[PDB]
Automatic annotation (TrEMBL), chain B:
An example Gene Ontology molecular-function term: metal ion binding
Stated family: Belongs to the sodium:neurotransmitter symporter (SNF) (TC 2.A.22) family. SLC6A4 subfamily.
InterPro entries for this protein: Na/ntran_symport, Na/ntran_symport_serotonin_N, SNS_sf
Compartments reported by the entry: Cell junction, Focal adhesion; Cell membrane; Cell projection, Neuron projection; Endosome membrane
SUPFAM superfamilies cross-referenced by the UniProt entry: SNF-like
Membrane topology field: Multi-pass membrane protein
Transmembrane segments: 10-28, 40-61, 82-110, 173-190, 202-228, 248-272, 284-309, 344-365, 386-411, 417-438, 458-480, 492-517
Binding site for Na(+): 16, 18-19, 23, 258, 290, 356, 359-360
Protein name: Transporter
One annotated Gene Ontology cellular component of this protein: plasma membrane
Annotated keywords: Antiport, Cell junction, Cell membrane, Cell projection, Disulfide bond, Endosome, Glycoprotein, Membrane, Metal-binding, Neurotransmitter transport, Phosphoprotein, Sodium, Synapse, Transmembrane, Transmembrane helix, Transport
One Pfam family cited in the UniProt record for this chain: 5HT_transport_N
Amino acid sequence: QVQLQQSGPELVKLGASVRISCKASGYRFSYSWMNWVKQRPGKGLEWIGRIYPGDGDTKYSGKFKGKATLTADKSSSTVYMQLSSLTSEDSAVYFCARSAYGSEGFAMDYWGQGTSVT
Amino acid sequence: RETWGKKVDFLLSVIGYAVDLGNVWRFPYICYQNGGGAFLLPYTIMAIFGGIPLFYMELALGQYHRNGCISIWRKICPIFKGIGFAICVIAFYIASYYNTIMAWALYYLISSFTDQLPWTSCKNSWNTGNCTNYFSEDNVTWMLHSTSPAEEFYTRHVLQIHRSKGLQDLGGISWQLALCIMLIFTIIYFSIWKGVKTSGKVVWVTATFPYIILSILLVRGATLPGAWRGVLFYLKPNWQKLLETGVWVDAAAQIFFSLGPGFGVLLAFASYNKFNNNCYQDALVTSVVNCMTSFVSGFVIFTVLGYMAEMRNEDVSEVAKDAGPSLLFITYAEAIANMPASTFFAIIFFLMLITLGLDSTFAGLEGVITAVLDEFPHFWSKRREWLALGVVITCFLGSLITLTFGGAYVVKLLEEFATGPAVLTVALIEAVAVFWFYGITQFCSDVKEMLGFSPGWFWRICWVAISPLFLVFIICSFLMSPPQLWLFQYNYPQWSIILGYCIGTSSFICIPTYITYRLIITPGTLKERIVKGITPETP
Amino acid sequence: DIVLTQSPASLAVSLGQRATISCRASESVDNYGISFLNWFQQKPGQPPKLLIYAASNQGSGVPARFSGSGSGTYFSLNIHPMEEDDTAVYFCQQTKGVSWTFGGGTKVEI
Ligand SMILES: CC(C)CCC[C@@H](C)[C@H]1CC[C@H]2[C@@H]3CC=C4C[C@@H](OC(=O)CCC(=O)O)CC[C@]4(C)[C@H]3CC[C@]12C
Ligand SMILES: CC(C)CCC[C@@H](C)[C@H]1CC[C@H]2[C@@H]3CC=C4C[C@@H](OC(=O)CCC(=O)O)CC[C@]4(C)[C@H]3CC[C@]12C
Ligand SMILES: CCCCCCCCCCCCO[C@@H]1O[C@H](CO)[C@@H](O[C@H]2O[C@H](CO)[C@@H](O)[C@H](O)[C@H]2O)[C@H](O)[C@H]1O
Ligand SMILES: *[C@@H]1O[C@H](CO)[C@@H](O[C@@H]2O[C@H](CO)[C@@H](O)[C@H](O)[C@H]2NC(C)=O)[C@H](O)[C@H]1NC(C)=O
Ligand SMILES: COC(=O)[C@H]1[C@@H](OC(=O)c2ccccc2)C[C@@H]2CC[C@H]1N2C
Ligand SMILES: [Cl-]
Ligand code: NA
Ligand code: NA
């Protein structure tokens, strides 16, 4: 069994920063990509990036190269995520997911719980 | 008639022909499987007894008549003129999978041009599942179906073998491999465009880089943790395994393959030599150089294997579950991935493999061109380029089927067939014809006129006593042991063995067909029919 | 960054009617025989759940009614039959080796 745990919602002021973690257990933590998505209230999903715990390689899709940073800690088998310069535009819920194997097309099968960031 | 030009040109060309891509993995595997560290003594004995004499005979035959690989028989024994066609078809069959392996190596070199080697980690798309076959395992882990990331890179990105269900589901053509093989083919065509002058000019470059590359690889492997264990593994005599004829047969087959008599390359190369050239010294130098090169290659391969085993904290030969062309692209790929200098050494090794294959490809194509052309002397105006283009196109068509996604299966089938009893039987036919129909005394007189001194009694008794006996023993041993092919998680079906046998027979069948054609084309009685084809045609 | 467009934006399908959802990308997502495209499904106030991986194989805890097929550029997802619990937004996302982008989603009502 694979279970992903996420922290509770937080409150972010103008220009502040937030730290979101994701505990992974029940599978090979170092051999599965950890990716995060952004879901606006009433809107669709939005990919924010990914990170490989076994290599520390982070990939960014949009303009979040300098806005979102992805860090991984293999000691506690959890993946962190940091965002800088947070405003009310991004007042959405961020999810955490683990990518599946390559033969399954990097399936985003396992999800977390989502944190309501204001 | 044109000569080789410089004496060093022919020596370097034949040395590059002697060294082969298959001489870097087959020799260590056959020395480890049979004999062990004591494998050198039967190897050396078989070499001295039956490989050097064949090389000397082929060099003398090429130098005497200054002809190709079909007209030589017509000059010595017209009843056996199918040997040229057999050599041509053998060379084409070999060159198909050879150019396929060249395309694979070129693709590996192209993909190894990045700062981070793509097969270091299994985070990419081609690597999907098992990833517990790694280096420096801090924590204990073991699965019965583990797969190395380098194996996934080789079998799912370069070969893309996962898209094919074997020899049956053979569909899809890789475009990157197609481009790599096209560039390799055009490089080969430009290398042998005009003739032997350009061949020697390019051999001067691509026959010296492999040696310095091997020296660099050896000095790198020596200064590695655990190289001593591999050294002892390569140098651990096992005299208990030397009590059966199987090891002797394997050593004789290995040395015959490495030296390569009857391939139709030595005759063509010696045809361009001067009439007053000492072939004895050339043959001895080539033999010792090839032997030392094979020994150095075995040393470096075993050193790398021992270093890998020490890094994996396990005994050696457990990291070599597969033997063949994939052995390099797996073990050496992992070793350079774990090496502190990855890109440079990977590029150097891939360039070494490219040069090793290219030299043999030029030698084979030049031999085929000489054999085909010398049958028709009336085509010395502008036919050389057209013939080169035609043989290149034929090789491309033959390798097109091997260029598919599941082309590794057919490549291995050819390499185990395309190279094997079909060539040894041709060499045996050549030797038996020369030493029984042309006459041993006649050949000795001819070589004495060539050099100035009659050959010693050692070669005279060897060529008639032990070389044909060893060749027929090799043929009998190989024909009495059906092969059991085994690629990655795949067992070859029964019909694959039949297909391999038929394609191997299609080369040797040239000699009986030409025998029947000459029998039915030469007028006379039943007794005089053979007589006409035995005596050489008057000049 | 491959741009993915999902049409129609809103689907009105009742019980007993096949619901086909198709999204078309801009570049082919097939490189090694596997289509790097997956279909999701999320309920309001619920995390999204994977339905089919590689656009051809069903998931672990996904009902067999969420069949999907397609290769190259055009992909289709058909649900037949469907119940009142399928009134969820379906998303298709590419998983290329350079960057990942999300679609727009279809608001399934009833
Ligand atoms: C031990 C491994 C790791 C590296 C060793 C390198 C040698 C095996 C290579 C490097 C240069 C090669 C040499 C390049 C020059 C030729 C000249 C050639 O000289 C001739 O006999 C003809 C020349 C003439 O006609 O003047 C003899 C072979 C030789 C020495 C070659 C023999 C094999 C050599 C030494
Ligand atoms: C240093 C060792 C561990 C490397 C293993 C390779 C050698 C043991 C083999 C490889 C090539 C063999 C050589 C091939 C050429 C012949 C020529 C031969 O010259 C002759 O005088 C015999 C012919 C004649 O007199 O008619 C002497 C032995 C020799 C050097 C052989 C000796 C043993 C050799 C060097
Ligand atoms: C006389 C006319 C002959 C016409 C052609 C006949 C072809 C017959 C079908 C191919 C016969 C088997 O083909 C040959 O099998 C032998 C073992 O048997 C394989 O040999 C393999 O195992 C042996 C050990 O037994 C090793 O020493 C060898 O290095 C390895 O390649 C050869 O690689 C393959 O070339
Ligand atoms: C590791 O490799 C093994 C075998 O190489 C894989 O086991 C096979 O998996 C496929 C697909 O999951 C099944 O169809 C086969 O039946 C399995 N083989 C056996 C003998 O059961 C295993 O899935 C790989 N690990 C991964 C992909 O994570
Ligand atoms: C597989 O056989 C070869 O590659 C042969 C040879 O190559 C060819 O004869 C050849 C023929 C046609 C195309 C390419 C190579 C190089 C050396 C010497 C004999 C043998 N190899 C050990
Ligand atoms: Cl050898
Ligand atoms: Na050789
Ligand atoms: Na070579």
